[PDB]
RNA sequence: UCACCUUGACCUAUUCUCAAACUUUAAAUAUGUAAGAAGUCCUUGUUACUUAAUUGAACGUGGACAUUUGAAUGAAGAGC
RNA sequence: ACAGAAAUCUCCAGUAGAACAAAAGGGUAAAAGCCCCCUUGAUUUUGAUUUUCAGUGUGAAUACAAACCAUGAAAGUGUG
RNA sequence: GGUUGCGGCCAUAUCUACCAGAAAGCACCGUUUCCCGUCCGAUCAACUGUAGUUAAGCUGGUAAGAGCCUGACCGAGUAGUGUAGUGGGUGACCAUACGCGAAACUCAGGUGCUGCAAUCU
């Protein structure tokens, strides 16, 4: 149709929720760092339930956002770990998709004090050129209805390049 | 989806340009409100706007029925002064600010007095008032919505308008060369930014590193065979031309306004009438409930 | 006990007038007030500084002083059996000009103009206003207007 | 152990509702406001009979129960309980207070009453045209439980709707009428034609 | 013992016995609360005008 | 059933009825100001305030306008 | 992924249905909310004004003036 | 007439859905040495109008569209209400006289106008 109506990856966020503070979540920040190439940022707890063992403002999670070419190959590693089997679910109505894995840091390895593993959440945000209009300071517009990402368009793009299959066992 | 009728009835719109995202009315109140005991004195702002591919500097006062432009200078009229490429760079913002300073001081009769910094060195300077003469033209900077950051081209325009002899109140911690340790501006980086040195050093290091980037970027420089080490005298001759003739020649206007108007009317969809709306509704009723 | 604070009984007076909340438009800040101008007082509820007391809502007075963001207003207030002059220090968003002093000044200009065309010729032009007068003699035609009306109506319930 | 209704007969106070300031109001004993065949079609019950107040007073919720049960039972006995539709058209929203000797004499909530005007319907019944005498006799029996004067007006409207009987027939033998579960929906000249085709097929002929 | 707290009865008839007075305006009101910088310059602008009309007539 | 008369809700379009401490709307009565000589225009004097700049501001000089001089009715004298 | 109605992360909607120390009302959306940076204008002098009112006091508030400062690129704002 | 920058009045301008937009502009878009800013050059900053595009933004139109605005001898001189009576009625309340006068409703119409500057087949 139009090269400016093409569907891209813009960011990929790697969330590890470790409902506590200390050495475990410090190493969970570490295991995000050498994969992303980027220092991650921790997230405080919003409130306190006293059932999850979390208190308010406790830094109980880490996450990092990776963009451009670096996001694409981490997504490729995640799909090789998931064996290219996403579900009928995992795809948002807004055209974003994610999953969860653990222990895929087998290559690209640092000094590696292997005491304790972490699982990890992949989430991929998908858009088109012109998404600056909803993020820029001046003339903050809304992406048009034709230009929005949808679940059908993102699953068509996903069962294109990476040539995977969804919903299948 | 599904905005309710109660929501639509109770909704209050923002003005028009808050909706358009062009006017911080919070900032505009503070920039436009005159001292009430200075009764009808217009408060003048140097509006500096950076679109892609143009720099706009306008000296504007405000009235009840709308704003009034005193003088305007654009970066696309700097090719008359000898700047063809890089028309939104930091130095181009400087040349546009110098041009609006000289044009306004020629329009107001303050061109003999208030020459400004005639030889640009890059030092922090304010236009001093001439004793037993007119005070200099006091202009207040309107950066609009864009962020105040160290090295931004709004302060290039500020620096050029101050060097052209306008009184613009400004500190110096937002020019390139400022450092957060010592409260001192660096005139070396400030003067290199004024004379385009940050562009020129990039052309030098791309020409010594890799050429597929130096042919994508700066292609028009190579087509107009401009050297990296020769931007400084282009900018200097441009400043001399600005200080020698800033008087705003306009363009040719080239197929005049009625011929513009009649040709551009042939692409306006015209609003329909009640007769075509009733006929449209009746034909739609026939097409939709006429039993196929 | 009882309560007589500064903004007591101002639930509706300083309210902000449906779908006109938020920022004040800028002609309010660009109107120019001279000493001697006759101004109306209506407090904006969204600006809490320079705000008049609730007594002065709907009161009309004379500018005696002009300051950085505010004007002083003379208001006559009926304290007991006499009138006291009150001096108010009101910011200009609680202030608007009186349209009566517009209308009277165009009547002054009209009076001067018709006195000039009376001096040109035709003196005694009779340039005061008059109250509404009893109407003169009409002739009412019956041309396509034959007077045809029925009677009072019977009672029906229509419930 | 209850005050007679002549104490709280007249609208002497501002309406005192159950609010965030009242908080301790006893329940209205009238809880059923539609009776008979309430689910019936608008076409089922064309004739509307109204019991209408002639006075500005208050009707207690006790009196509303006592008249609703009497009119319902007479109409059920004589004509069957699915041949009429009864609607109490007033709701006891005003809290009556009792002070149970004048220092601090503000009252605690006694009960609930309904403030009626001259010309408000208290009870409306829709039936077939052949049930008119039974309905008028049921409403005139229900008069005795209410203080004040009340008239029985035959409505010139089809059913509980707000348009005349020839106007409703002109509207339904044309195509501006479609059924709801107990009421009806009317077709307008305003709105999107796609929705006015999505409902109301039988028009546009 | 308990008595009559407050009433405004008869107070308007008392205020109209001497018939509520307007405060008798004058040419040249006072500079009470007029801006001090304007007052300071008004002093000198009237000093110079006194001298100007002194030299105009003598 | 391991997609079924006998589903809690929730949403959608309707429906009956209300509020001293609810409200988009909103009277009547009551209430503020004005309806000029201390007014209006024309010209130019002051200043340390104000303006980029006699630009304004405020107060002025000199001049033009005579009771229909700026709605009504009354005024019992008015003011102190 | 653990992870469910509640932990984190992403998108969309969202006119305020949140928040603003404490009652209730008013006000507020590139904010008066939230988060960050810099600070002490919560300073000095002594008048004026508003509300309570006798046009006394006290409390509280408004707008200026003379300084000295803070903040910001600035207009400006800041006498809790 | 289009478009831009700065506006004024702040929905006749908003919202939902669809369809068009020549020229210029605006825009998306391209790059990260430099000033600067982030977990992330996404936002902010810088550089080039070059590699590309009208897909979106933006503008305009359409809709028995929602909302909003205007008007109506539409409802309605209705409700309410000032004044009056040794009016009526046990009362609740009501009528008359001299005046003022709504809202919902129902119809019809409309769907931004405009100031300064600059630019454009
Ligand atoms: Mg704002
Ligand atoms: Mg700002
Ligand atoms: Mg109070
Ligand atoms: Mg209040
Ligand atoms: Mg109000
Ligand atoms: Mg305060
Ligand atoms: Mg007894
Ligand atoms: Mg009582
Ligand atoms: Mg009875
Ligand atoms: Mg005693
Ligand atoms: Mg006593
Ligand atoms: Mg009394
Ligand atoms: Mg007396
Ligand atoms: Mg007295
Ligand atoms: Mg009351
Ligand atoms: Mg209301
Ligand atoms: Mg008079
Ligand atoms: Mg001035
Ligand atoms: Mg506290
Ligand atoms: Mg006192
Ligand atoms: Mg005293
Ligand atoms: Mg106190
Ligand atoms: Mg204070
Ligand atoms: Mg100050
Ligand atoms: Mg304080
Ligand atoms: Mg304060
Ligand atoms: Mg980019």
PDB file of C-alpha atoms in Angstrom, chain D residues 6-110:
ATOM      1  CA  UNK D   6     -53.942  14.733  60.644  1.00  0.00           C
ATOM      2  CA  UNK D   7     -50.674  15.639  62.405  1.00  0.00           C
ATOM      3  CA  UNK D   8     -48.736  15.192  59.153  1.00  0.00           C
ATOM      4  CA  UNK D   9     -51.515  15.939  56.687  1.00  0.00           C
ATOM      5  CA  UNK D  10     -50.335  19.263  55.228  1.00  0.00           C
ATOM      6  CA  UNK D  11     -47.066  20.214  53.511  1.00  0.00           C
ATOM      7  CA  UNK D  12     -45.906  22.492  56.291  1.00  0.00           C
ATOM      8  CA  UNK D  13     -42.151  21.938  55.986  1.00  0.00           C
ATOM      9  CA  UNK D  14     -39.491  22.001  53.343  1.00  0.00           C
ATOM     10  CA  UNK D  15     -39.035  18.497  51.875  1.00  0.00           C
ATOM     11  CA  UNK D  16     -36.831  16.547  54.283  1.00  0.00           C
ATOM     12  CA  UNK D  17     -35.356  13.657  52.275  1.00  0.00           C
ATOM     13  CA  UNK D  18     -33.222  10.750  53.378  1.00  0.00           C
ATOM     14  CA  UNK D  19     -29.734  12.031  52.644  1.00  0.00           C
ATOM     15  CA  UNK D  20     -26.218  12.011  54.048  1.00  0.00           C
ATOM     16  CA  UNK D  21     -27.585  14.271  56.814  1.00  0.00           C
ATOM     17  CA  UNK D  22     -30.661  12.205  57.730  1.00  0.00           C
ATOM     18  CA  UNK D  23     -29.181   8.674  57.872  1.00  0.00           C
ATOM     19  CA  UNK D  24     -31.719   7.005  60.219  1.00  0.00           C
ATOM     20  CA  UNK D  25     -34.937   6.950  58.200  1.00  0.00           C
ATOM     21  CA  UNK D  26     -37.363   4.022  58.633  1.00  0.00           C
ATOM     22  CA  UNK D  27     -38.355   2.090  55.550  1.00  0.00           C
ATOM     23  CA  UNK D  28     -41.364   3.006  53.458  1.00  0.00           C
ATOM     24  CA  UNK D  29     -43.943   0.303  53.851  1.00  0.00           C
ATOM     25  CA  UNK D  30     -45.124   0.714  50.268  1.00  0.00           C
ATOM     26  CA  UNK D  31     -42.554  -1.195  48.222  1.00  0.00           C
ATOM     27  CA  UNK D  32     -44.588  -2.390  45.226  1.00  0.00           C
ATOM     28  CA  UNK D  33     -45.592   0.283  42.752  1.00  0.00           C
ATOM     29  CA  UNK D  34     -46.657  -1.758  39.702  1.00  0.00           C
ATOM     30  CA  UNK D  35     -49.327  -4.442  40.054  1.00  0.00           C
ATOM     31  CA  UNK D  36     -51.480  -6.597  37.821  1.00  0.00           C
ATOM     32  CA  UNK D  37     -50.174  -7.504  34.371  1.00  0.00           C
ATOM     33  CA  UNK D  38     -47.267  -5.067  34.352  1.00  0.00           C
ATOM     34  CA  UNK D  39     -45.507  -6.842  31.467  1.00  0.00           C
ATOM     35  CA  UNK D  40     -48.423  -6.293  29.087  1.00  0.00           C
ATOM     36  CA  UNK D  41     -48.182  -4.653  25.684  1.00  0.00           C
ATOM     37  CA  UNK D  42     -49.230  -1.027  25.148  1.00  0.00           C
ATOM     38  CA  UNK D  43     -51.776  -2.352  22.640  1.00  0.00           C
ATOM     39  CA  UNK D  44     -53.207  -4.678  25.315  1.00  0.00           C
ATOM     40  CA  UNK D  45     -54.482  -1.969  27.682  1.00  0.00           C
ATOM     41  CA  UNK D  46     -55.790   1.063  25.749  1.00  0.00           C
ATOM     42  CA  UNK D  47     -57.952   2.696  28.428  1.00  0.00           C
ATOM     43  CA  UNK D  48     -56.301   4.714  31.204  1.00  0.00           C
ATOM     44  CA  UNK D  49     -58.127   5.747  34.382  1.00  0.00           C
ATOM     45  CA  UNK D  50     -56.536   8.174  36.853  1.00  0.00           C
ATOM     46  CA  UNK D  51     -57.105   8.837  40.560  1.00  0.00           C
ATOM     47  CA  UNK D  52     -56.102  12.498  40.810  1.00  0.00           C
ATOM     48  CA  UNK D  53     -55.574  14.659  43.896  1.00  0.00           C
ATOM     49  CA  UNK D  54     -57.613  17.834  44.311  1.00  0.00           C
ATOM     50  CA  UNK D  55     -55.643  19.173  47.287  1.00  0.00           C
ATOM     51  CA  UNK D  56     -52.075  20.107  48.298  1.00  0.00           C
ATOM     52  CA  UNK D  57     -51.331  17.645  51.085  1.00  0.00           C
ATOM     53  CA  UNK D  58     -49.213  14.666  52.116  1.00  0.00           C
ATOM     54  CA  UNK D  59     -50.094  10.998  51.664  1.00  0.00           C
ATOM     55  CA  UNK D  60     -48.500   8.635  54.138  1.00  0.00           C
ATOM     56  CA  UNK D  61     -46.879   5.425  52.926  1.00  0.00           C
ATOM     57  CA  UNK D  62     -49.308   3.571  55.215  1.00  0.00           C
ATOM     58  CA  UNK D  63     -52.217   5.111  53.300  1.00  0.00           C
ATOM     59  CA  UNK D  64     -50.496   4.297  49.990  1.00  0.00           C
ATOM     60  CA  UNK D  65     -50.315   0.607  50.982  1.00  0.00           C
ATOM     61  CA  UNK D  66     -53.872   0.660  52.313  1.00  0.00           C
ATOM     62  CA  UNK D  67     -55.261   2.034  49.062  1.00  0.00           C
ATOM     63  CA  UNK D  68     -53.053  -0.018  46.723  1.00  0.00           C
ATOM     64  CA  UNK D  69     -54.107  -3.298  48.359  1.00  0.00           C
ATOM     65  CA  UNK D  70     -57.811  -2.384  48.238  1.00  0.00           C
ATOM     66  CA  UNK D  71     -57.839  -1.301  44.583  1.00  0.00           C
ATOM     67  CA  UNK D  72     -55.697  -4.307  43.602  1.00  0.00           C
ATOM     68  CA  UNK D  73     -57.899  -6.764  45.461  1.00  0.00           C
ATOM     69  CA  UNK D  74     -61.193  -5.424  44.089  1.00  0.00           C
ATOM     70  CA  UNK D  75     -59.832  -5.469  40.535  1.00  0.00           C
ATOM     71  CA  UNK D  76     -58.316  -8.946  41.049  1.00  0.00           C
ATOM     72  CA  UNK D  77     -61.565 -10.372  42.447  1.00  0.00           C
ATOM     73  CA  UNK D  78     -63.986  -8.837  39.966  1.00  0.00           C
ATOM     74  CA  UNK D  79     -61.878  -8.862  36.792  1.00  0.00           C
ATOM     75  CA  UNK D  80     -58.886 -11.167  37.304  1.00  0.00           C
ATOM     76  CA  UNK D  81     -55.364 -10.133  38.285  1.00  0.00           C
ATOM     77  CA  UNK D  82     -54.014 -10.114  34.702  1.00  0.00           C
ATOM     78  CA  UNK D  83     -56.670  -7.814  33.206  1.00  0.00           C
ATOM     79  CA  UNK D  84     -55.385  -4.528  34.657  1.00  0.00           C
ATOM     80  CA  UNK D  85     -52.130  -2.717  35.256  1.00  0.00           C
ATOM     81  CA  UNK D  86     -51.855  -0.567  38.385  1.00  0.00           C
ATOM     82  CA  UNK D  87     -49.172   2.044  38.987  1.00  0.00           C
ATOM     83  CA  UNK D  88     -48.627   4.015  42.169  1.00  0.00           C
ATOM     84  CA  UNK D  89     -47.376   7.302  40.747  1.00  0.00           C
ATOM     85  CA  UNK D  90     -46.239   8.914  44.008  1.00  0.00           C
ATOM     86  CA  UNK D  91     -43.314   7.858  46.152  1.00  0.00           C
ATOM     87  CA  UNK D  92     -43.015   8.691  49.860  1.00  0.00           C
ATOM     88  CA  UNK D  93     -39.743  10.616  49.773  1.00  0.00           C
ATOM     89  CA  UNK D  94     -40.431  13.110  52.585  1.00  0.00           C
ATOM     90  CA  UNK D  95     -39.378  12.144  56.102  1.00  0.00           C
ATOM     91  CA  UNK D  96     -41.840  13.020  58.848  1.00  0.00           C
ATOM     92  CA  UNK D  97     -40.261  13.744  62.229  1.00  0.00           C
ATOM     93  CA  UNK D  98     -41.605  13.222  65.752  1.00  0.00           C
ATOM     94  CA  UNK D  99     -40.425  14.897  68.953  1.00  0.00           C
ATOM     95  CA  UNK D 100     -40.947  12.308  71.681  1.00  0.00           C
ATOM     96  CA  UNK D 101     -40.321  19.916  76.840  1.00  0.00           C
ATOM     97  CA  UNK D 102     -39.368  22.356  74.094  1.00  0.00           C
ATOM     98  CA  UNK D 103     -35.636  22.802  74.752  1.00  0.00           C
ATOM     99  CA  UNK D 104     -33.764  20.837  72.087  1.00  0.00           C
ATOM    100  CA  UNK D 105     -37.054  19.818  70.505  1.00  0.00           C
ATOM    101  CA  UNK D 106     -35.868  18.834  67.033  1.00  0.00           C
ATOM    102  CA  UNK D 107     -37.545  15.628  65.990  1.00  0.00           C
ATOM    103  CA  UNK D 108     -36.283  12.187  65.110  1.00  0.00           C
ATOM    104  CA  UNK D 109     -37.641  10.461  61.959  1.00  0.00           C
ATOM    105  CA  UNK D 110     -41.184   9.135  62.407  1.00  0.00           C
TER     106      UNK D 110
END
